[PDB]
UniProtKB/Swiss-Prot annotation:
Its biological purpose: With S4 and S12 plays an important role in translational accuracy.
Residue ranges constituting the S5 DRBM domain according to the UniProt record: 2-65
Gene Ontology cellular component annotations, sorted alphabetically: small ribosomal subunit
Assembly information from the UniProt record: Part of the 30S ribosomal subunit. Contacts proteins S4 and S8.
Protein name (database record): Small ribosomal subunit protein uS5
Alphabetically ordered keywords of this record: Ribonucleoprotein, Ribosomal protein, RNA-binding, rRNA-binding
GO BP: translation
Notes on the domains: The N-terminal domain interacts with the head of the 30S subunit; the C-terminal domain interacts with the body and contacts protein S4. The interaction surface between S4 and S5 is involved in control of translational fidelity.
Amino acid sequence: NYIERVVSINRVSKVVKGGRRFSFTALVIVGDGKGMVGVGYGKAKEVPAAIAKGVEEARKNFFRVPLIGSTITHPVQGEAAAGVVMLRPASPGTGVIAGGAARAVLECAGVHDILAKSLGSDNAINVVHATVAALKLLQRPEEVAARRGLPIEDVAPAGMLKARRESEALAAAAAREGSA
RNA sequence: UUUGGAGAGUUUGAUCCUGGCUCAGGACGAACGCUGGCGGCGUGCUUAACACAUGCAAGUCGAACGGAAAGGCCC
Ligand SMILES: [Mg+2]
Ligand SMILES: [Mg+2]
Ligand SMILES: [Mg+2]
Ligand SMILES: [Mg+2]
Ligand SMILES: [Mg+2]
Ligand SMILES: [Mg+2]
Ligand SMILES: [Mg+2]
Ligand SMILES: [Mg+2]
Ligand SMILES: [Mg+2]
Ligand SMILES: [Mg+2]
Ligand SMILES: [Mg+2]
């Protein structure tokens, strides 16, 4: 089960000595809803071929989201492409607050609570690149502590330890219910 | 040690950037246009600090005095 979405459809054109040659380009985002993200950019002369190319490229290119239970770990300032997209977690149930392309990519990621803002070049392609880079910039507390050579309690806050323990207990309960 | 950030259209044969405009949101001591049933609770000259017909919005003491004009009683 994968989540599919389309963000923008553009009628690109090419010129020859005879006249105008039209073409179609599409960008799609694929995700499993658990924290696995794939982006695809596909070009054709017709929408079905375009979306097929986009889906294939997205299937080729994947990326994993290290989310804590339901939300993001820490605020991230994703500076890439030409747009500035700033992501940070929030209180559970607040919702994934983001623009169009960011909305699509985060919903395909499966996150449920995020605060986002795009600060320039509202173009969908650049926004998607900036969000992907923002997720790449994300760091996870366990291997952050491993890199720093200091144990978890001496690195990460007790509140996020409590949240992680609650998330682990909920995941264990869900696994038990699914097995039974 | 806890609470809360959305964008989209629009320059080009085509796109990327910058950059400008516009729209989706809430609010008013508001008004005009159609329509219109009641009840409760608020609000009411933002301009002309312009002139204002009439009547109201500042009175109380005989246990302060002299008195009795108008009411009472008694000859
Ligand atoms: Mg910078
Ligand atoms: Mg901008
Ligand atoms: Mg914009
Ligand atoms: Mg709050
Ligand atoms: Mg234009
Ligand atoms: Mg130009
Ligand atoms: Mg044009
Ligand atoms: Mg009424
Ligand atoms: Mg009233
Ligand atoms: Mg008078
Ligand atoms: Mg007096």
